[PDB]
């Protein structure tokens, strides 16, 4: 069964998540909206989605993006998306700051862990508003709807659908976020021991929490189907840091906060 320590660890996680996650994005506003190596900088074709705003008043605005052609007109969705990253990243920074195990680390190590994990916890805070029947991320009054339902050739997508299929609980979707924020192997971490011991506690609690609350055959090898997911999320996260730095190197759009995160 679960111990008192584990129960208190999940409760601090769940608490921090409640307090710092706006699942309806009420406080997301005043954000922008669409009015050589380039070769590759057509990295934007992979992250292309149609966007929908409802008002409230009953209105609907819908944006359908263009087609890679000529050159520009594809950046037409780099300012708003950056606004969304910034809204997200701040929720993720508040999440970390309000966990005692995190506030206890030295400042320089908090900054290391945030820069390693911000993406990963976003993409997780995002799987839970993902709708895999319609392929869309329901962000409150905002929708980002995916434009062959077999092009999960896109890592990110192939990872959103897989994750979704697991039907994790809020306690899961939370512990996976601890496990990923506390990675000892992140550039610039000093207290590599403490952090490794912390991760190790978060894992064993996830594993107990599953063997305690999921006896069904569908849930077998789950804890591991989950750990491998995280290992994968680390890779997608590298591939996109890189992709994102390319776009930025030729068409600067990162907010200050994203500059801090990526050390620009
Ligand atoms: C906002 C980013 S895309 C993005 N595009 C850029 N050009 C730069 C940056 Cl920094 N981010 C995003 C949005 C959603 C919505 C659902 O899942 C998501 C995962 N990531």
Curated annotation (Swiss-Prot):
Every copy of the NR LBD domain together lies at 5-264
**Where located?**
Nucleus
Keyword presence, Nucleus: yes
- Name the UniProt key words of this record, in alphabetical order: Activator, DNA-binding, Metal-binding, Nucleus, Receptor, Transcription, Transcription regulation, Zinc, Zinc-finger
Domain of life from the UniProt record? Eukaryota
Q: Does the keyword Repeat apply?
A: no
Q: Which GO terms describe its biological process?
A: cell differentiation; cellular response to molecule of bacterial origin; intestinal epithelial structure maintenance; intracellular receptor signaling pathway; negative regulation of DNA-templated transcription; negative regulation of transcription by RNA polymerase II; positive regulation of DNA-templated transcription; positive regulation of gene expression
Cite the binding residues for hyperforin: 85, 123-126, 240
Disulfide-linked positions: none
Q: Which GO terms describe its molecular function?
A: DNA-binding transcription activator activity, RNA polymerase II-specific; DNA-binding transcription factor activity, RNA polymerase II-specific; nuclear receptor activity; nuclear receptor binding; RNA polymerase II cis-regulatory region sequence-specific DNA binding; RNA polymerase II transcription regulatory region sequence-specific DNA binding; sequence-specific double-stranded DNA binding; zinc ion binding
**Tissue localization of expression:** Expressed in liver, colon and small intestine.
Q: How does it assemble?
A: Heterodimer with RXR. Interacts with NCOA1. Interacts (via domain NR LBD) with CRY1 and CRY2 in a ligand-dependent manner.
UniProt lists the family membership as follows:
Belongs to the nuclear hormone receptor family. NR1 subfamily.
Name used for this protein in its record: Nuclear receptor subfamily 1 group I member 2
Protein's gene: NR1I2
Please give the range of the full-length protein represented by this chain.
142 to 431 of 434
């Amino acid at each position: 069964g679960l111990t008192e320590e584990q129960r208190m660890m999940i409760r601090e996680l769940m608490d921090a998540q409640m307090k710092t996650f706006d699942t309806t994005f009420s406080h997301f506003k005043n954000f922008r909206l669409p009015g050589k190596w380039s070769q590759v900088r057509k990295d934007l074709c992979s992250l292309k989605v149609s966007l929908q705003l409802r008002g409230e008043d009953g209105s609907v605005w819908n944006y359908k993006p263009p087609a890679d052609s000529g050159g520009k007109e594809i950046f037409s969705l780099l300012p708003h998306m950056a606004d969304m990253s910034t809204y997200m990243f701040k929720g993720i920074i508040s999440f970390a700051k309000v966990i005692s195990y995190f506030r206890d680390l030295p400042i320089e190590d908090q900054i290391s862990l945030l820069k390693g994990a911000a993406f990963e916890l976003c993409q997780l805070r995002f799987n839970t508003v993902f709708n895999a029947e319609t392929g869309t991320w329901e962000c409150g009054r905002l929708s980002y709807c995916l434009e062959f339902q077999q092009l999960l050739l896109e890592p990110m997508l192939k990872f959103h659908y897989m994750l979704k299929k697991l039907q994790l609980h809020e306690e899961e979707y939370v512990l996976m976020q601890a496990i990923s924020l506390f990675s000892p192997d992140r550039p610039g971490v000093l207290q590599h021991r403490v952090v490794d011991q912390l991760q190790e506690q978060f894992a064993i609690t996830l594993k107990s929490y599953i063997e305690c609350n999921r006896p069904q055959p569908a849930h077998r090898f789950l804890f591991l189907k989950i750990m491998a997911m995280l290992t994968e999320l680390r890779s997608i996260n590298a591939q996109h840091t890189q992709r994102l730095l390319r776009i930025q190197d030729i068409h600067p759009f990162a907010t200050p906060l994203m500059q801090e995160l990526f050390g620009i």
